[PDB]
Design a protein around this ligand. Structure first.
Ligand SMILES: [Mg+2]
Ligand SMILES: [Mg+2]
Ligand SMILES: [Mg+2]
Ligand SMILES: [Mg+2]
Ligand SMILES: [Mg+2]
Ligand SMILES: [Mg+2]
Ligand SMILES: [Mg+2]
Ligand SMILES: [Mg+2]
Ligand SMILES: [Mg+2]
Ligand SMILES: [Mg+2]
Ligand SMILES: [Mg+2]
Ligand SMILES: [Mg+2]
Ligand SMILES: [Mg+2]
Ligand SMILES: [Mg+2]
Ligand SMILES: [Mg+2]
Ligand SMILES: [Mg+2]
Ligand SMILES: [Mg+2]
Ligand SMILES: [Mg+2]
Ligand SMILES: [Mg+2]
Ligand SMILES: [Mg+2]
Ligand SMILES: [Mg+2]
Ligand SMILES: [Mg+2]
Ligand SMILES: [Mg+2]
Ligand SMILES: [Mg+2]
Ligand SMILES: [Mg+2]
Ligand SMILES: [Mg+2]
Ligand SMILES: [Mg+2]
Ligand SMILES: [Mg+2]
Ligand SMILES: [Mg+2]
Ligand SMILES: [Mg+2]
Ligand SMILES: [Mg+2]
Ligand SMILES: [Mg+2]
Ligand SMILES: [Mg+2]
Ligand SMILES: [Mg+2]
Ligand SMILES: [Mg+2]
Ligand SMILES: [Mg+2]
Ligand SMILES: [Mg+2]
Ligand SMILES: [Mg+2]
Ligand SMILES: [Mg+2]
Ligand SMILES: [Mg+2]
Lengths: 101, 116, 70, 87
RNA sequence: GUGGGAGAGGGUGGUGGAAUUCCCGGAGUAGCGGUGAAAUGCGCAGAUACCGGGAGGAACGCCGAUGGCGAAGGCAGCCACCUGGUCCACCCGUGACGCUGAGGCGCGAAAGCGUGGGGAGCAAACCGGAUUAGAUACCCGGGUAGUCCACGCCCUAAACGAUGCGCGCUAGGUCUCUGGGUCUCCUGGGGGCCGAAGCUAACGCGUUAAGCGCGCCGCCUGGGGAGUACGGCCGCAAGGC
């Protein structure tokens, strides 16, 4: 497999049953596409710089994964099809460049 | 006739003209002035004088509309783009924030051959 | 008129997710600072660049802002 | 990619004796693997000339090591060839 | 071979903000635009300036460089995937397997052709506007091909470093990109500048030779006629050798 990072950014006006269902469906997508969880950090609510979807802020999840090769893109197409996910980004992991150290 | 008393003041300057727009804090206009609003005709429109004259004029108008507190937004970099702000500061309105908004592309559009 | 990495923690350059540090390299308008005023090196700066643009895509950092005074 | 044990299969397979990573055998199998993979990519991605060029240089390599083997040890070269199906 | 690195090298998929245009909506009048000054043009069917919403196409500011990658043309948003080349360290493996390359074969900016798509801005031709000896040219306002994408042709150029490739020799200094090191410094590989010896008609070049040598290819032989004419090959053509 390979070492990836996923960022998800959603609409902050979600109640609890909603945000639950979203998260669940993301999990079921990672499973379904081959990707596995190394860890999770969800910082959640924060105030952006430019409005994304007319919204002044957003709800961020960060999921660090390991997975197959070809599948990555199609996986993120499945993530993006969501209506409450206003943004998704993926990256291959990088080693923590420490500068000025 | 609205009785507004606080709002946005836009300056706009090309090297060909100047236009001021007084407006309300969610963006709708109140009055406006320009180079030719005052009778100035030709190239004479892109002077700093008429810049002044217009600022003062639109300021005057809105000041009779009831305007007091006015926060400025300058789009365009031009001839007496300054003299317009420099005027409507001394208008009697109170200039609160002067902001420079001159909008610039991230390189999208092939410009008229004059322009490169 | 001090540089940036002159007063600053010794920190991960290649992290987009963290704003608190990344912002300190942008002007009042969103403009990424030039070398002279950033202080860092060419591989550094080249990396600072990519990190910033990545975060700009996450809406955490700005693409451009407005200039006050004037 | 071409991963590491993905290579080791081949190197350990065409070796003349334990430890030989360098002879014409190894060299030509390795090369020829790289070659076939590229042909696979360039099957789609027809539009990519800058990879294609490199693949020319690559088959030219293969061919040159082969003329070497042939002129130097004929049997081992017929061996290698009928091992890889080619020429 | 192994270990590590830099990169706008290429390709496929996706996606992000600024800006131009246009359509919808609001608020708001008498002008806007444009020039040396003008006019055509657009504006009461409500423009310009302003705020919100949508559609679409192209191009990626800052970073950015006197910088990097590529054989050459050439290559800049970001993410992923497929992939070429190349540098260094280790001194491990093969054992001269090398250089050059007539002929072939392929890539080759822009423009141009063919068949489809697409079309925001620009814009040959073109339609108009002032200059004013006179526009039919510079200046202004419209505008079609084209510019973009897929497929197939075309093969040119100041395709330039006007400098063919490869290797070995021959002071240094300085600025920089990128590896390694015992990291005031040293040691490989790129990119600049000044300069030893040396070369050069001069300008200039000078370890990135235009120096000293060897190998191989291309090419030259006063100017015009003329890159024309005839012929041959290629091309749908324009045209090219
Ligand atoms: Mg004017
Ligand atoms: Mg005041
Ligand atoms: Mg690239
Ligand atoms: Mg409207
Ligand atoms: Mg009129
Ligand atoms: Mg009319
Ligand atoms: Mg709009
Ligand atoms: Mg349309
Ligand atoms: Mg620049
Ligand atoms: Mg060039
Ligand atoms: Mg690579
Ligand atoms: Mg040895
Ligand atoms: Mg031996
Ligand atoms: Mg030839
Ligand atoms: Mg061509
Ligand atoms: Mg073309
Ligand atoms: Mg034609
Ligand atoms: Mg066409
Ligand atoms: Mg036009
Ligand atoms: Mg005339
Ligand atoms: Mg025109
Ligand atoms: Mg040149
Ligand atoms: Mg020539
Ligand atoms: Mg040449
Ligand atoms: Mg010679
Ligand atoms: Mg070094
Ligand atoms: Mg070091
Ligand atoms: Mg050097
Ligand atoms: Mg040097
Ligand atoms: Mg010199
Ligand atoms: Mg001398
Ligand atoms: Mg000589
Ligand atoms: Mg001399
Ligand atoms: Mg030499
Ligand atoms: Mg010479
Ligand atoms: Mg003659
Ligand atoms: Mg000719
Ligand atoms: Mg003929
Ligand atoms: Mg014929
Ligand atoms: Mg011709």
């Amino acid at each position: 497999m390979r070492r990836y990072e996923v960022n998800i950014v959603l609409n902050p006006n979600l109640d609890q049953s909603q945000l639950a269902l979203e998260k669940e469906i993301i999990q079921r997508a990672l499973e379904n596409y081959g990707a596995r969880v190394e860890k999770v950090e969800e910082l959640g609510l924060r105030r952006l710089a430019y409005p994304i979807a007319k919204d002044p802020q957003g709800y961020f999840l960060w999921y660090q994964v390991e997975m197959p090769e070809d599948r990555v893109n199609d996986l993120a197409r499945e993530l993006r099809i969501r209506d409450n996910v206003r943004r998704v980004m993926v990256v291959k992991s990088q080693e923590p460049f420490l500068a000025n150290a | 006739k609205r009785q507004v008393a606080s709002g946005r003041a836009y300056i706009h300057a090309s090297y060909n003209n100047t236009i001021v727009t007084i407006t309300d804090p969610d963006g709708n206009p109140i009055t406006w002035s320009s180079g030719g609003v005052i009778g100035y005709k030709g190239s004479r429109k892109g002077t700093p004088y008429a810049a002044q004259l217009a600022a003062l004029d639109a300021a005057k108008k809105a000041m009779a509309y009831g305007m007091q507190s006015v926060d400025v937004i300058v789009r365009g970099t031009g001839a007496g783009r300054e003299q317009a702000i420099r005027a409507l500061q001394a208008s009697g309105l109170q200039v609160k924030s002067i902001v420079d908004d001159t909008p610039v592309p991230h390189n999208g559009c092939r410009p008229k051959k004059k322009f490169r | 008129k001090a540089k940036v990495k002159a007063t600053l923690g010794e920190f991960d350059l290649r992290d987009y997710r963290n704003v608190e540090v990344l912002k300190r390299f942008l002007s009042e308008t969103g403009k990424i600072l030039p070398r002279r005023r950033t202080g860092l090196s060419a591989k550094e700066q080249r990396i600072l660049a990519k990190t910033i643009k990545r975060a700009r895509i996450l809406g955490l950092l700005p693409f451009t802002e407005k200039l006050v005074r004037k | 990619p071409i991963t590491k044990e993905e290579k080791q299969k081949v190197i350990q397979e065409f070796a003349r004796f334990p430890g030989d990573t360098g002879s014409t055998e190894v060299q030509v199998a390795l090369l020829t693997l790289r070659i076939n993979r590229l042909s696979e990519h360039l099957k789609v991605h027809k539009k990519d000339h800058h990879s294609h060029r490199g693949l020319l240089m690559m088959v030219g390599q293969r061919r040159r090591l082969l003329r070497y083997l042939q002129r130097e040890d004929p049997e081992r070269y017929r061996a290698l060839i009928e091992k890889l199906g080619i020429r």
